Amino acid sequence: SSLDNIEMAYARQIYIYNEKIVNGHLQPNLVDLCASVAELDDKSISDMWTMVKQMTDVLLTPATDALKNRSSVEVRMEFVRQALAYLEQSYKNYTLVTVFGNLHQAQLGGVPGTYQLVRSFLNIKLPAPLPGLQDGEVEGHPVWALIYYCMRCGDLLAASQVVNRAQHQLGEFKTWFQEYMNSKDRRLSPATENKLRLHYRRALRNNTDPYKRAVYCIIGRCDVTDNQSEVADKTEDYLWLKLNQVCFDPQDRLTLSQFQKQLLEDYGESHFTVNQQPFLYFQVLFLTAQFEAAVAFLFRMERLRCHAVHVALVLFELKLLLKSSGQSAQLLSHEPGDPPCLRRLNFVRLLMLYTRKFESTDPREALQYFYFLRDEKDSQGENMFLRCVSELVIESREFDMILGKLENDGSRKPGVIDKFTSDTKPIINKVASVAENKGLFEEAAKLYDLAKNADKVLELMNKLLSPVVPQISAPQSNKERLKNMALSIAERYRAQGISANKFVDSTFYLLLDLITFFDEYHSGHIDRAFDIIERLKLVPLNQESVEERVAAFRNFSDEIRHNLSEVLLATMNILFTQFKRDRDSQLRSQARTLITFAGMIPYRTSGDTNARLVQMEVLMN
């Protein structure tokens, strides 16, 4: 097996999600089905899916195009809020593990109020007082530190409580903050927003209290260039600092498009992967709505291929992933007729790479991933899922497992693909078609016979029999192994009343009779073998039938005319033997008949055959 522990667990989860859609059940939450395995690994992966769920848990317009949802200002706004809610809660967990040694340890004693937690967080991260703080303290801590880390944790209420106990010190900041907490989308009114920004810009552009600076332009979304590096030293603190500063419809203003493009264009992977920590960059792209970038990026880490494919599937089963129309493009690209700030993922290629790894010895699991390509076609029109099953069968040669083995008793035990579509007639011909083009007739027959395509089964069975008609049928020979399959196809084609056009069909049952004629001839059962050839009315034995038999030879399958030489000789040698054992006249007359027939028929080795036939007739007299 080519699948690692983690990859295998995901496969099982994707089998469920397929079993549900294959039986018409409720469309379960894919993101939940993937996070179910994440908990079996380190929390590096669990915290990823947590971000994936929260970033995709946005009210969408079902049955709407992918590009439309992702271009709409409506959806683009909720992404920023879902991310900020993740950066705030994520930071809140950092503040817990900073005070208590373990999340469990914090829980048993009880998570304290965000206010008392933050206070018990300031104790550690600033033990001694910084001399540059302003506006005094509140219950033993600087008022601005409390406000910042409370807003950072996302509890505006806890921050407003701090403000209520410092009404005299904070001046007019109270009426401004109380408006920020009330107004939605973390934005103030243009009039009041103007009043505070100008005040900050007036004489507080450079204040000795960094926490004061941070809060002001987090509330006013100002000084976008100043990264407030004094307080936002971590990467998440930067993302959170900026997403609280982005704006929507000219100076000192930043928008999501600029920010998202500004980040990866100027500070690409190189900047965010110098510490050899891959998820750091992924979180930067995913929490900025650049899902295709983050997916391709994370898909290149050979250790995190599994995770990047699935986060692509989630975005794909939620009409959020922007697929690349052309299949000839690179993995990541920007369509020419699209804005430059969005990118597109060649989803078809993405799955095709992941599959090649475990498609060789783990076919069942491969199909589960090929199903997501059911909705796509190629330039030639083939259904992508169907084509992927053809290529996977041509390579793996797993016919019984994937296509269903058709035993020699008339049964068709369904295969693994039967689960996904009930119309399995084309691919069985596709797989049968190539194997036919590769001279693998004995297989192409079994495959065509699996799809009950007798036109092709009998055609190929005619080719495999004609060479072996006069041969000696011996144990385990190529004659027995082909005759016995032909008879197993004769019964199942009569018991089920199946037949190809009379040309193909007539020749097929005719060869089977001839194969019996030589099997009796090679055994010495002369009398019995003579009777068979007489029924077939293939070789004339009375002079009257020569005219009609000669005309019939003209339109009989060349697979029959080929073996005419051996038939005449065996029949002659049959009469020849019976002569040495009135009757003499009758054999003599029949001997003549064979000669005149052979004389009027142009066929294989007519030279040596016509001569031998005449000699055997002379010895009779």
């Binding site: 936002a232 030293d233 990467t235 930067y238 980040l263 500070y267 510490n275 998820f279 750091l280």
Partner: peptide
């Protein structure tokens, strides 16, 4: 000048 130090 954003930092590259992940929250640990």
């Amino acid at each position: 000048a954003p930092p590259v130090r992940s929250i640990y």
